[PDB]
Design an enzyme around this catalytic site. Structure first.
Site, mmCIF file in Angstrom:
data_model
loop_
_atom_site.group_PDB
_atom_site.id
_atom_site.type_symbol
_atom_site.label_atom_id
_atom_site.label_comp_id
_atom_site.label_asym_id
_atom_site.label_seq_id
_atom_site.Cartn_x
_atom_site.Cartn_y
_atom_site.Cartn_z
ATOM 1 N N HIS A 172 4.071 10.551 2.443
ATOM 2 C CA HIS A 172 4.463 11.348 1.139
ATOM 3 C C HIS A 172 3.121 11.776 0.274
ATOM 4 O O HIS A 172 3.225 12.001 -0.548
ATOM 5 C CB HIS A 172 5.435 10.659 0.354
ATOM 6 N N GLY B 226 -0.106 4.290 -8.227
ATOM 7 C CA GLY B 226 -1.202 4.326 -7.287
ATOM 8 C C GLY B 226 -1.245 2.963 -6.438
ATOM 9 O O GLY B 226 -2.484 3.012 -5.643
ATOM 10 N N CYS C 247 0.689 2.483 -3.654
ATOM 11 C CA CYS C 247 1.435 2.836 -2.458
ATOM 12 C C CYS C 247 0.491 2.934 -1.270
ATOM 13 O O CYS C 247 -0.947 3.364 -1.475
ATOM 14 C CB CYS C 247 2.056 4.224 -2.473
#
EC number: 3.4.19.12
Lengths: 300, 299
Positions: A41, A143, A145
């Site tokens: 993503h 942030g 991920c």
């Protein structure tokens, strides 16, 4: 007295974290030999997230749309591919600090360390277990991920988790390093409900066996119970059912001590109904379910 | 909201194994000095009444074996700075990071790299208790393990493990060999004082819960300082100073709840209990998060 949750040393993982930027989206990556693994993503904007067509978005990207950056050294993305929910960015340079590594998929009740990073830059490390609802209860701000979870066995780092999503009730969801989500979750901004979280029964029992070994003896009783009867009581307290597999795993612990597993189950049943009465078990005021039997049987 | 430790990589490359006679423990390799507890020169029989300044005179450079993994370092000199042996080696550590020696105060937090025979085994975050002990996880062989905080690029070493008390608590020194607390490096009956709850740390944790959306403990009342202190001792809480109020000021702006207003909530939680409730999933009040840790982890 005292059995504190220690996390694995993070040095071998610190030299593998990088920063991946696509458009205006930036997250963390994992740099192993010549591949950067990151959540897919990264190729999405905010309004792509509601109903993303990942194949439509990826086929429109080129290698130069991916800015990968290890500290201040810019790596050049040289090709790319998608395995399930992870993107694999292949780069010109192999990572000189690649440790001996392995990809493993774990089951609920298993523990690992998490290295939280914000832009290819580690911030903190903590130990956790994957809950029976396939979620992890950590501190992941926006942030984070791409942060990974790992165990170290001698010299081998076993990567088992990569953070993808936060869920509306505060918990986090992710995949293995092959791109398969743990649990029924998807990488969409949809209404995703985690199930009921239940206490890990076999972990509590292994913890209580450690207490007997280190001196704590006050919770024991003279009673025994059947596996069927115990599960009928435990479910009223939202405890995971116990299987015959769990009983055999606890066997060495029941061998070092004299207490049979079903004997220890009767004591646990008594603790749930009475409470701690303001006393402690290995410096802890709660039945605490994030130590696995394997960790107990060795550090014993 | 979890209790995170600092990344340990910069410290992992400094751990070594120091052996003298039959005793083996951990050392800190920085530039060209190995720092380790001075009782490594003592046998198990020498610890009753050790006279270190006489025991060291007999020792020579060849009685110390220092291993950094598979390599061997030679000791070309030895010296002692109050409770720490400084062994000078022939090779400088190329992994030496930007570092600094600091002494911390009770209530402050840091990470510990627990080691066995020079091998890093685990890391955890802890706070220095007001009785100058740490409730850590050290077994036999973890003497010489270090505690640290990490500034941007600078590692601040603040602690070295020396002894293990007969309560589960552990005691140690700073990197210049000064003990935290009324302890000595002898084998004798040693007792840690009465442990108190770090009041300022609990308040910072209650501010963290408001930021995370739990606000049920908030009430309309406010109290004075002096009134809170009288309640504080009765339940063994550290007396609160005006400096503590100014420490928490950043978190008072982010929430709109003042320290003495929040003090009224804390006073009420100690008397009437928590009414069968949870704050951040806990039935217990956490006191090992400093105000600075809350700012780092939240804002």
């Amino acid at each position: 007295s005292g059995f504190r949750k220690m996390a694995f040393p993070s040095g071998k993982v610190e030299g593998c974290m990088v920063q991946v930027t696509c458009g205006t989206t930036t997250l963390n990556g994992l740099w192993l030999d010549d591949v950067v693994y990151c959540p897919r993503h990264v190729i999405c904007t905010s309004e792509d997230m509601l109903n993303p067509n990942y194949e439509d978005l990826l086929i429109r990207k080129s290698n130069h749309n991916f800015l990968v950056q290890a500290g201040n050294v810019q790596l050049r993305v040289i090709g790319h591919s998608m395995q399930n929910c992870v993107l694999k960015l292949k780069v010109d340079t192999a990572n000189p600090k690649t440790p001996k590594y392995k990809f493993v998929r774990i089951q609920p009740g298993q523990t690992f360390s998490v290295l939280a990073c914000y832009n290819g830059s580690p911030s903190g490390v903590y130990q956790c277990a994957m809950r029976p609802n396939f979620t992890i209860k950590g501190s992941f701000l926006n942030g984070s991920c791409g942060s990974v979870g790992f165990n170290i066995d001698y010299d081998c780092v076993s990567f088992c988790y990569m953070h993808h999503m936060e869920l509306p009730t505060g918990v986090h969801a992710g995949t293995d390093l092959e791109g398969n989500f743990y649990g029924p979750f998807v990488d969409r901004q949809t209404a995703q409900a985690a199930g009921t979280d239940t206490t890990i029964t076999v972990n509590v029992l292994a913890w209580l066996y450690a207490a007997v070994i280190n001196g704590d003896r006050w919770f024991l009783n003279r009673f025994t119970t059947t596996l069927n009867d115990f599960n009928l009581v435990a479910m009223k307290y939202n405890y995971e059912p116990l299987t015959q597999d769990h009983v055999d795993i606890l066997g060495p612990l029941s061998a070092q001590t004299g207490i049979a597993v079903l004997d220890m189950c009767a004591s646990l049943k008594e603790l749930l109904q009475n409470g701690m009465n303001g006393r402690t078990i290995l410096g802890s005021a709660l039945l605490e379910d994030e130590f696995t039997p394997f960790d107990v049987v060795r550090q014993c």
